[PDB]
Amino acid sequence: LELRLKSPVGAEPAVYPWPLPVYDKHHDAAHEIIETIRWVCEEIPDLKLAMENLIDYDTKSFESMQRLCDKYNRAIDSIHQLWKGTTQPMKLNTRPSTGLLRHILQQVYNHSVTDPEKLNNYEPFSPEVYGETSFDLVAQMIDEIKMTDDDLFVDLGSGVGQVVLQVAAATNCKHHYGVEKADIPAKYAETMDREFRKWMKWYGKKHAEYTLERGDFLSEEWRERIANTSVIFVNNFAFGPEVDHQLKERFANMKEGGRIVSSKPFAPLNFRINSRNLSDIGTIMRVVELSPLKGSVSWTGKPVSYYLHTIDRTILENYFSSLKNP
Ligand SMILES: Nc1ncnc2c1ncn2[C@@H]1O[C@H](CSCC[C@H](N)C(=O)O)[C@@H](O)[C@H]1O
């Protein structure tokens, strides 16, 4: 006893058991199905036409849901016949739109994070405190911090890996990495990885290369990896002064133009270079606050902020030039 959705591009159908599972208070498989059909309709205008010709969905009855799926599946067959005619088939090889990606990542997450409660079982007041950066902040990061095929992206402390997946889907960096130390999120990230590749194949959408790794970003191996990374993302809000200090040491080896996006600044925003602070990491970076997304508040009730650091040794060079002057 099952529900099936055919892939728009001929991948293996998506199959859902009955009764349909629930993911949390605001997400279940029934609505995932309905939204998936909605989104495939956005990918294919012709399919959207066929679906207009709409019905009552209850989400409680098998026959009603089996009915909805059958109507979608029949419309998919016909579109597939259309593509055998003269009609150009949906272009493959494209990136998903923002709206489609959101849905894809929610879907991947719901299928991968089988017990979301388990992510809260970290040692409190430690660097392992878990918190998820929202899809919208990542989207803003992607928009403002323009990346090219020259860039290498790393999420330091990548959790279940969903920041990496979003960036990999939206940009053409040569490679994207996430590294995560804790067992529970790193275990989930393995399923996130498989579900992402599967679902992206299912929709016929491409992503850049990425790897999700278990590891410790303070390790010897990671010193060099960090030095060669051009865009670092790091949700360091709960890392603490010790870990932040260790990261500063790693960042001091980065190249000009290297960028770090973080939820807590690595240097003060008003940094004034002088004779006492010569070795502070502030001597080699510009730090700006990224614009808050309209009406977004933190647990502090203040607009949640992220910070962009750009490696710029020009700061230091200019100070030393000034010392050869009046
Ligand atoms: N030394 C270290 N190496 C790898 N991961 C670390 C670490 N110290 C802390 N972390 C991880 O950093 C994560 C912070 S939560 C942020 C998760 C994700 N990047 C997001 O923004 O949505 C936690 O999972 C914690 O385990």
mmCIF file of C-alpha atoms and ligand atoms in Angstrom:
data_model
loop_
_atom_site.group_PDB
_atom_site.id
_atom_site.type_symbol
_atom_site.label_atom_id
_atom_site.label_comp_id
_atom_site.label_asym_id
_atom_site.label_seq_id
_atom_site.Cartn_x
_atom_site.Cartn_y
_atom_site.Cartn_z
ATOM 1 C CA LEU A 1 0.000 0.000 0.000
ATOM 2 C CA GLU A 2 1.764 3.090 -1.419
ATOM 3 C CA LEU A 3 1.696 6.460 -3.224
ATOM 4 C CA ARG A 4 3.880 7.145 -6.251
ATOM 5 C CA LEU A 5 5.067 10.286 -8.006
ATOM 6 C CA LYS A 6 6.733 10.046 -11.392
ATOM 7 C CA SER A 7 9.865 12.104 -12.052
ATOM 8 C CA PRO A 8 9.547 14.889 -14.673
ATOM 9 C CA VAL A 9 12.802 13.652 -16.226
ATOM 10 C CA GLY A 10 12.427 9.861 -15.988
ATOM 11 C CA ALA A 11 14.311 9.175 -12.740
ATOM 12 C CA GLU A 12 12.968 6.507 -10.363
ATOM 13 C CA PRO A 13 9.551 7.473 -9.035
ATOM 14 C CA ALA A 14 9.217 8.803 -5.497
ATOM 15 C CA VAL A 15 7.322 6.305 -3.356
ATOM 16 C CA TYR A 16 5.521 7.110 -0.089
ATOM 17 C CA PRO A 17 4.129 4.534 2.367
ATOM 18 C CA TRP A 18 0.575 4.636 3.719
ATOM 19 C CA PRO A 19 -0.492 5.986 6.142
ATOM 20 C CA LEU A 20 1.556 9.080 5.314
ATOM 21 C CA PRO A 21 4.170 10.047 7.895
ATOM 22 C CA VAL A 22 4.309 13.301 9.842
ATOM 23 C CA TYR A 23 7.627 15.142 10.189
ATOM 24 C CA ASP A 24 6.860 17.716 12.885
ATOM 25 C CA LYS A 25 3.988 19.959 14.000
ATOM 26 C CA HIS A 26 4.059 21.912 10.706
ATOM 27 C CA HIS A 27 5.214 19.353 8.111
ATOM 28 C CA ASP A 28 3.902 16.029 6.857
ATOM 29 C CA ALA A 29 4.379 13.810 3.801
ATOM 30 C CA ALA A 30 0.894 14.626 2.418
ATOM 31 C CA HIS A 31 1.738 18.284 2.064
ATOM 32 C CA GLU A 32 5.209 17.412 0.728
ATOM 33 C CA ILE A 33 3.413 15.493 -2.068
ATOM 34 C CA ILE A 34 1.075 18.375 -2.877
ATOM 35 C CA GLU A 35 3.930 20.909 -2.856
ATOM 36 C CA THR A 36 6.137 18.646 -4.989
ATOM 37 C CA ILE A 37 3.369 18.532 -7.644
ATOM 38 C CA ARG A 38 3.016 22.317 -7.339
ATOM 39 C CA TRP A 39 6.754 22.773 -7.924
ATOM 40 C CA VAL A 40 7.023 20.355 -10.849
ATOM 41 C CA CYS A 41 4.187 22.444 -12.363
ATOM 42 C CA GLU A 42 6.468 25.529 -12.021
ATOM 43 C CA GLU A 43 9.225 23.627 -13.843
ATOM 44 C CA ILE A 44 6.928 22.681 -16.731
ATOM 45 C CA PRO A 45 4.281 25.155 -18.007
ATOM 46 C CA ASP A 46 2.557 22.409 -20.058
ATOM 47 C CA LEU A 47 2.151 20.299 -16.944
ATOM 48 C CA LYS A 48 0.753 23.301 -15.076
ATOM 49 C CA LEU A 49 -1.830 23.731 -17.860
ATOM 50 C CA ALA A 50 -2.927 20.097 -17.529
ATOM 51 C CA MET A 51 -3.209 20.364 -13.751
ATOM 52 C CA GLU A 52 -5.558 23.387 -13.917
ATOM 53 C CA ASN A 53 -8.227 21.046 -15.390
ATOM 54 C CA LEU A 54 -7.950 20.924 -9.785
ATOM 55 C CA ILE A 55 -10.007 19.038 -7.181
ATOM 56 C CA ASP A 56 -10.767 18.627 -3.466
ATOM 57 C CA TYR A 57 -7.828 17.174 -1.522
ATOM 58 C CA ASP A 58 -8.402 15.967 2.049
ATOM 59 C CA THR A 59 -4.929 14.534 2.907
ATOM 60 C CA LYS A 60 -6.728 12.048 5.197
ATOM 61 C CA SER A 61 -8.077 9.514 2.672
ATOM 62 C CA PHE A 62 -5.922 7.143 0.649
ATOM 63 C CA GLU A 63 -8.202 7.130 -2.423
ATOM 64 C CA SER A 64 -8.265 10.958 -2.518
ATOM 65 C CA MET A 65 -4.460 11.166 -2.324
ATOM 66 C CA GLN A 66 -4.002 8.221 -4.730
ATOM 67 C CA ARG A 67 -6.401 10.146 -6.988
ATOM 68 C CA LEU A 68 -4.275 13.334 -6.868
ATOM 69 C CA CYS A 69 -1.094 11.375 -7.607
ATOM 70 C CA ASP A 70 -2.695 9.504 -10.546
ATOM 71 C CA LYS A 71 -3.753 12.801 -12.109
ATOM 72 C CA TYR A 72 -0.197 14.130 -11.831
ATOM 73 C CA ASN A 73 1.321 10.873 -13.100
ATOM 74 C CA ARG A 74 -1.029 10.791 -16.135
ATOM 75 C CA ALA A 75 -0.134 14.408 -16.936
ATOM 76 C CA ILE A 76 3.552 13.444 -16.701
ATOM 77 C CA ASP A 77 3.082 10.595 -19.223
ATOM 78 C CA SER A 78 1.420 12.961 -21.687
ATOM 79 C CA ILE A 79 4.201 15.579 -21.330
ATOM 80 C CA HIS A 80 6.707 12.793 -21.950
ATOM 81 C CA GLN A 81 4.796 11.981 -25.192
ATOM 82 C CA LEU A 82 4.802 15.674 -26.111
ATOM 83 C CA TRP A 83 8.591 15.645 -25.814
ATOM 84 C CA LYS A 84 8.669 12.690 -28.249
ATOM 85 C CA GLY A 85 6.903 14.972 -30.744
ATOM 86 C CA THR A 86 8.343 18.322 -31.820
ATOM 87 C CA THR A 87 8.071 20.056 -28.399
ATOM 88 C CA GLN A 88 11.466 20.792 -26.802
ATOM 89 C CA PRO A 89 11.877 18.888 -23.537
ATOM 90 C CA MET A 90 12.611 20.745 -20.304
ATOM 91 C CA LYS A 91 16.240 21.857 -20.381
ATOM 92 C CA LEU A 92 18.421 19.664 -18.139
ATOM 93 C CA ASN A 93 21.598 20.938 -16.464
ATOM 94 C CA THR A 94 19.953 24.041 -14.924
ATOM 95 C CA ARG A 95 20.024 25.323 -11.351
ATOM 96 C CA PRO A 96 16.796 25.255 -9.405
ATOM 97 C CA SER A 97 15.032 28.526 -8.819
ATOM 98 C CA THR A 98 15.149 29.873 -5.230
ATOM 99 C CA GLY A 99 11.542 28.799 -4.533
ATOM 100 C CA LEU A 100 12.171 25.278 -5.880
ATOM 101 C CA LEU A 101 15.430 24.999 -3.867
ATOM 102 C CA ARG A 102 13.668 25.953 -0.645
ATOM 103 C CA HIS A 103 11.172 23.138 -1.244
ATOM 104 C CA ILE A 104 13.921 20.700 -2.202
ATOM 105 C CA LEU A 105 15.900 21.389 0.987
ATOM 106 C CA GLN A 106 12.827 21.122 3.183
ATOM 107 C CA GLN A 107 12.055 17.752 1.501
ATOM 108 C CA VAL A 108 15.666 16.502 1.922
ATOM 109 C CA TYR A 109 15.689 17.630 5.548
ATOM 110 C CA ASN A 110 12.334 15.950 6.381
ATOM 111 C CA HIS A 111 13.473 12.672 4.826
ATOM 112 C CA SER A 112 16.932 12.790 6.503
ATOM 113 C CA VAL A 113 16.483 14.196 9.988
ATOM 114 C CA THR A 114 14.363 11.305 11.258
ATOM 115 C CA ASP A 115 14.401 12.500 14.835
ATOM 116 C CA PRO A 116 14.957 16.308 14.912
ATOM 117 C CA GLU A 117 14.857 16.289 18.712
ATOM 118 C CA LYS A 118 18.194 14.432 18.738
ATOM 119 C CA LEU A 119 20.003 17.573 17.412
ATOM 120 C CA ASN A 120 19.282 19.270 20.738
ATOM 121 C CA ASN A 121 21.214 16.594 22.674
ATOM 122 C CA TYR A 122 24.524 18.508 22.708
ATOM 123 C CA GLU A 123 26.536 19.587 25.741
ATOM 124 C CA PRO A 124 25.165 23.076 26.550
ATOM 125 C CA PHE A 125 27.546 26.023 27.038
ATOM 126 C CA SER A 126 30.075 24.215 24.809
ATOM 127 C CA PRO A 127 31.213 24.788 21.174
ATOM 128 C CA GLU A 128 28.867 21.959 20.204
ATOM 129 C CA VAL A 129 25.737 24.118 20.750
ATOM 130 C CA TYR A 130 23.546 23.500 17.696
ATOM 131 C CA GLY A 131 21.673 26.211 15.775
ATOM 132 C CA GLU A 132 20.551 26.344 12.132
ATOM 133 C CA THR A 133 21.133 29.305 9.838
ATOM 134 C CA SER A 134 17.881 29.995 7.964
ATOM 135 C CA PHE A 135 17.395 29.474 4.213
ATOM 136 C CA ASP A 136 16.770 33.238 3.800
ATOM 137 C CA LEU A 137 20.056 34.326 5.380
ATOM 138 C CA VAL A 138 21.984 31.839 3.246
ATOM 139 C CA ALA A 139 20.081 33.213 0.196
ATOM 140 C CA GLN A 140 21.116 36.741 1.106
ATOM 141 C CA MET A 141 24.691 35.566 1.560
ATOM 142 C CA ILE A 142 24.598 33.982 -1.890
ATOM 143 C CA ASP A 143 23.231 37.235 -3.417
ATOM 144 C CA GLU A 144 25.641 39.664 -1.721
ATOM 145 C CA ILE A 145 28.823 37.566 -1.660
ATOM 146 C CA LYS A 146 28.966 36.801 -5.357
ATOM 147 C CA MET A 147 30.926 33.639 -6.033
ATOM 148 C CA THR A 148 32.508 32.382 -9.265
ATOM 149 C CA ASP A 149 34.082 29.123 -10.461
ATOM 150 C CA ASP A 150 37.316 30.448 -8.924
ATOM 151 C CA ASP A 151 35.885 30.244 -5.402
ATOM 152 C CA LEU A 152 36.135 27.498 -2.782
ATOM 153 C CA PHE A 153 33.376 27.506 -0.159
ATOM 154 C CA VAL A 154 33.598 26.009 3.319
ATOM 155 C CA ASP A 155 31.018 25.843 6.123
ATOM 156 C CA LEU A 156 33.010 25.415 9.341
ATOM 157 C CA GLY A 157 30.812 23.368 11.698
ATOM 158 C CA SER A 158 28.362 22.365 8.977
ATOM 159 C CA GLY A 159 25.754 20.633 11.171
ATOM 160 C CA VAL A 160 23.457 18.462 9.032
ATOM 161 C CA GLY A 161 24.952 20.237 5.997
ATOM 162 C CA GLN A 162 22.019 22.254 4.613
ATOM 163 C CA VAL A 163 24.007 25.516 4.128
ATOM 164 C CA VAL A 164 26.473 23.632 1.910
ATOM 165 C CA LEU A 165 23.638 22.020 -0.075
ATOM 166 C CA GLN A 166 21.958 25.380 -0.710
ATOM 167 C CA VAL A 167 25.214 27.063 -1.783
ATOM 168 C CA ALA A 168 26.172 24.069 -3.984
ATOM 169 C CA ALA A 169 22.753 24.274 -5.682
ATOM 170 C CA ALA A 170 22.926 28.013 -6.274
ATOM 171 C CA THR A 171 26.541 28.731 -7.253
ATOM 172 C CA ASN A 172 29.330 27.391 -9.418
ATOM 173 C CA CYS A 173 32.209 27.223 -6.947
ATOM 174 C CA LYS A 174 34.763 24.616 -7.933
ATOM 175 C CA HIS A 175 34.057 22.857 -4.644
ATOM 176 C CA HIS A 176 31.972 23.232 -1.488
ATOM 177 C CA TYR A 177 32.825 21.596 1.823
ATOM 178 C CA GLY A 178 31.184 21.179 5.146
ATOM 179 C CA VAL A 179 33.005 19.837 8.158
ATOM 180 C CA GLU A 180 31.227 18.787 11.324
ATOM 181 C CA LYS A 181 32.671 17.300 14.506
ATOM 182 C CA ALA A 182 29.630 16.056 16.445
ATOM 183 C CA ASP A 183 28.316 12.536 15.834
ATOM 184 C CA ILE A 184 24.571 13.186 15.651
ATOM 185 C CA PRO A 185 24.585 15.982 12.987
ATOM 186 C CA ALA A 186 27.447 14.358 11.056
ATOM 187 C CA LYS A 187 25.407 11.130 10.915
ATOM 188 C CA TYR A 188 22.333 12.968 9.619
ATOM 189 C CA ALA A 189 24.517 14.805 7.055
ATOM 190 C CA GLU A 190 25.283 11.425 5.395
ATOM 191 C CA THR A 191 21.570 10.903 4.667
ATOM 192 C CA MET A 192 21.190 14.618 3.751
ATOM 193 C CA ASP A 193 23.893 14.050 1.160
ATOM 194 C CA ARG A 194 22.198 10.983 -0.426
ATOM 195 C CA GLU A 195 18.673 12.474 -0.332
ATOM 196 C CA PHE A 196 19.915 15.728 -1.943
ATOM 197 C CA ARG A 197 21.617 13.956 -4.882
ATOM 198 C CA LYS A 198 18.547 11.718 -5.300
ATOM 199 C CA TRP A 199 15.969 14.528 -5.169
ATOM 200 C CA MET A 200 18.034 16.843 -7.399
ATOM 201 C CA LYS A 201 18.165 13.997 -9.949
ATOM 202 C CA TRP A 202 14.405 13.537 -9.492
ATOM 203 C CA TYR A 203 13.646 17.177 -10.423
ATOM 204 C CA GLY A 204 16.331 17.178 -13.133
ATOM 205 C CA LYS A 205 18.395 19.942 -11.518
ATOM 206 C CA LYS A 206 22.130 20.284 -11.185
ATOM 207 C CA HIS A 207 24.409 21.313 -8.346
ATOM 208 C CA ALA A 208 28.087 22.168 -8.056
ATOM 209 C CA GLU A 209 30.518 19.704 -6.524
ATOM 210 C CA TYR A 210 30.391 19.343 -2.733
ATOM 211 C CA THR A 211 31.566 17.098 0.072
ATOM 212 C CA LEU A 212 30.159 16.711 3.570
ATOM 213 C CA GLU A 213 32.847 15.541 5.989
ATOM 214 C CA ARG A 214 33.094 14.450 9.598
ATOM 215 C CA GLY A 215 36.058 16.160 11.271
ATOM 216 C CA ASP A 216 37.517 18.823 13.521
ATOM 217 C CA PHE A 217 38.219 22.162 11.826
ATOM 218 C CA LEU A 218 40.910 22.967 14.400
ATOM 219 C CA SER A 219 42.974 19.934 13.310
ATOM 220 C CA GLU A 220 46.386 20.111 11.664
ATOM 221 C CA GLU A 221 44.951 19.131 8.259
ATOM 222 C CA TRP A 222 42.387 21.957 8.409
ATOM 223 C CA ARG A 223 45.006 24.717 8.919
ATOM 224 C CA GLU A 224 46.049 24.512 5.253
ATOM 225 C CA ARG A 225 42.506 23.829 3.996
ATOM 226 C CA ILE A 226 41.335 27.046 5.646
ATOM 227 C CA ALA A 227 44.339 28.974 4.204
ATOM 228 C CA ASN A 228 43.322 27.940 0.681
ATOM 229 C CA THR A 229 39.532 28.624 1.120
ATOM 230 C CA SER A 230 38.207 31.791 -0.532
ATOM 231 C CA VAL A 231 34.773 31.913 1.194
ATOM 232 C CA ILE A 232 34.246 30.701 4.711
ATOM 233 C CA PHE A 233 30.857 30.461 6.346
ATOM 234 C CA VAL A 234 30.859 29.980 10.101
ATOM 235 C CA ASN A 235 28.003 30.142 12.560
ATOM 236 C CA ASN A 236 30.295 30.871 15.498
ATOM 237 C CA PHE A 237 27.720 32.516 17.743
ATOM 238 C CA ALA A 238 28.180 29.884 20.472
ATOM 239 C CA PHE A 239 31.819 28.890 19.842
ATOM 240 C CA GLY A 240 33.256 31.111 22.575
ATOM 241 C CA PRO A 241 36.497 33.177 22.887
ATOM 242 C CA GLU A 242 38.909 30.220 22.863
ATOM 243 C CA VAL A 243 37.633 28.696 19.605
ATOM 244 C CA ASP A 244 37.234 32.149 18.017
ATOM 245 C CA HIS A 245 40.878 32.914 18.900
ATOM 246 C CA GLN A 246 42.021 29.638 17.309
ATOM 247 C CA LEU A 247 39.993 30.481 14.160
ATOM 248 C CA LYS A 248 41.628 33.949 13.980
ATOM 249 C CA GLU A 249 45.010 32.160 13.833
ATOM 250 C CA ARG A 250 43.752 30.069 10.938
ATOM 251 C CA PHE A 251 42.287 33.073 9.122
ATOM 252 C CA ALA A 252 45.580 35.027 9.327
ATOM 253 C CA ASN A 253 46.923 32.657 6.624
ATOM 254 C CA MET A 254 44.161 33.410 4.094
ATOM 255 C CA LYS A 255 44.759 35.128 0.740
ATOM 256 C CA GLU A 256 43.849 38.695 -0.231
ATOM 257 C CA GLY A 257 40.176 38.948 -1.111
ATOM 258 C CA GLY A 258 39.395 35.879 1.047
ATOM 259 C CA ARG A 259 36.039 36.327 2.774
ATOM 260 C CA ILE A 260 34.481 35.081 6.009
ATOM 261 C CA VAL A 261 30.751 35.245 6.798
ATOM 262 C CA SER A 262 29.943 34.756 10.475
ATOM 263 C CA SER A 263 27.282 35.317 13.119
ATOM 264 C CA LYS A 264 29.800 36.949 15.493
ATOM 265 C CA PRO A 265 32.533 39.341 14.279
ATOM 266 C CA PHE A 266 36.155 38.218 14.379
ATOM 267 C CA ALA A 267 37.371 41.830 14.786
ATOM 268 C CA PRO A 268 35.664 45.053 15.942
ATOM 269 C CA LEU A 269 33.703 47.052 13.361
ATOM 270 C CA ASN A 270 35.480 50.276 14.366
ATOM 271 C CA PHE A 271 39.013 48.820 14.341
ATOM 272 C CA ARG A 272 41.660 51.543 14.501
ATOM 273 C CA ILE A 273 45.163 50.258 13.796
ATOM 274 C CA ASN A 274 47.770 51.499 16.313
ATOM 275 C CA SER A 275 51.009 50.547 18.108
ATOM 276 C CA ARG A 276 49.344 48.359 20.748
ATOM 277 C CA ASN A 277 47.140 46.227 18.455
ATOM 278 C CA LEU A 278 49.668 45.533 15.668
ATOM 279 C CA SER A 279 49.193 41.781 15.706
ATOM 280 C CA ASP A 280 45.369 41.783 16.068
ATOM 281 C CA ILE A 281 43.509 40.114 13.168
ATOM 282 C CA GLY A 282 41.735 43.476 12.677
ATOM 283 C CA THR A 283 44.987 44.688 11.026
ATOM 284 C CA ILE A 284 44.292 42.525 7.950
ATOM 285 C CA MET A 285 40.498 42.641 7.367
ATOM 286 C CA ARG A 286 37.551 44.871 6.598
ATOM 287 C CA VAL A 287 34.506 43.909 8.658
ATOM 288 C CA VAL A 288 30.969 44.995 7.721
ATOM 289 C CA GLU A 289 27.558 44.068 9.089
ATOM 290 C CA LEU A 290 25.346 42.468 6.461
ATOM 291 C CA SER A 291 21.978 44.189 6.077
ATOM 292 C CA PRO A 292 19.302 42.572 8.236
ATOM 293 C CA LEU A 293 16.424 40.935 6.387
ATOM 294 C CA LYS A 294 13.329 43.094 7.013
ATOM 295 C CA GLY A 295 11.464 41.980 10.129
ATOM 296 C CA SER A 296 13.778 39.253 11.362
ATOM 297 C CA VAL A 297 14.431 39.212 15.122
ATOM 298 C CA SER A 298 16.888 37.132 17.168
ATOM 299 C CA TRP A 299 16.087 35.536 20.539
ATOM 300 C CA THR A 300 17.409 38.859 21.933
ATOM 301 C CA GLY A 301 14.618 40.668 20.005
ATOM 302 C CA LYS A 302 17.253 42.600 18.063
ATOM 303 C CA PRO A 303 17.559 41.993 14.264
ATOM 304 C CA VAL A 304 19.815 38.905 13.753
ATOM 305 C CA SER A 305 23.122 39.959 12.274
ATOM 306 C CA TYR A 306 25.797 38.297 10.227
ATOM 307 C CA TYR A 307 29.189 39.841 9.380
ATOM 308 C CA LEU A 308 31.357 39.928 6.309
ATOM 309 C CA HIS A 309 35.127 39.944 6.727
ATOM 310 C CA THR A 310 37.367 40.612 3.720
ATOM 311 C CA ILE A 311 41.120 39.874 3.874
ATOM 312 C CA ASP A 312 42.775 43.194 3.090
ATOM 313 C CA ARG A 313 46.423 43.613 4.100
ATOM 314 C CA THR A 314 46.289 47.087 2.537
ATOM 315 C CA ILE A 315 45.228 48.223 6.022
ATOM 316 C CA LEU A 316 48.561 47.140 7.482
ATOM 317 C CA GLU A 317 50.691 48.365 4.552
ATOM 318 C CA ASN A 318 49.159 51.840 4.856
ATOM 319 C CA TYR A 319 49.839 52.049 8.584
ATOM 320 C CA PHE A 320 53.519 51.205 8.044
ATOM 321 C CA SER A 321 53.706 53.768 5.221
ATOM 322 C CA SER A 322 52.225 56.344 7.602
ATOM 323 C CA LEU A 323 55.049 55.562 10.068
ATOM 324 C CA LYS A 324 57.588 56.789 7.454
ATOM 325 C CA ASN A 325 55.849 60.203 7.355
ATOM 326 C CA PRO A 326 55.046 63.242 9.561
HETATM 327 N N1 LIG B 1 36.056 22.094 16.103
HETATM 328 C C1 LIG B 1 34.916 21.861 15.406
HETATM 329 N N2 LIG B 1 34.936 21.150 14.246
HETATM 330 C C2 LIG B 1 33.807 20.910 13.538
HETATM 331 N N3 LIG B 1 32.588 21.334 13.925
HETATM 332 C C3 LIG B 1 32.427 22.057 15.057
HETATM 333 C C4 LIG B 1 33.601 22.369 15.887
HETATM 334 N N4 LIG B 1 33.149 23.089 16.941
HETATM 335 C C5 LIG B 1 31.813 23.226 16.821
HETATM 336 N N5 LIG B 1 31.387 22.604 15.689
HETATM 337 C C6 LIG B 1 30.005 22.522 15.203
HETATM 338 O O1 LIG B 1 29.509 23.763 14.711
HETATM 339 C C7 LIG B 1 28.086 23.635 14.646
HETATM 340 C C8 LIG B 1 27.472 24.996 14.970
HETATM 341 S S1 LIG B 1 25.768 25.014 14.492
HETATM 342 C C9 LIG B 1 25.777 25.648 12.838
HETATM 343 C C10 LIG B 1 25.319 24.569 11.847
HETATM 344 C C11 LIG B 1 25.243 25.028 10.371
HETATM 345 N N6 LIG B 1 26.595 25.440 9.853
HETATM 346 C C12 LIG B 1 24.284 26.184 10.199
HETATM 347 O O2 LIG B 1 24.698 27.342 10.243
HETATM 348 O O3 LIG B 1 23.071 26.015 10.010
HETATM 349 C C13 LIG B 1 27.719 22.540 15.654
HETATM 350 O O4 LIG B 1 27.186 21.404 14.963
HETATM 351 C C14 LIG B 1 29.040 22.147 16.299
HETATM 352 O O5 LIG B 1 29.120 20.742 16.515
#
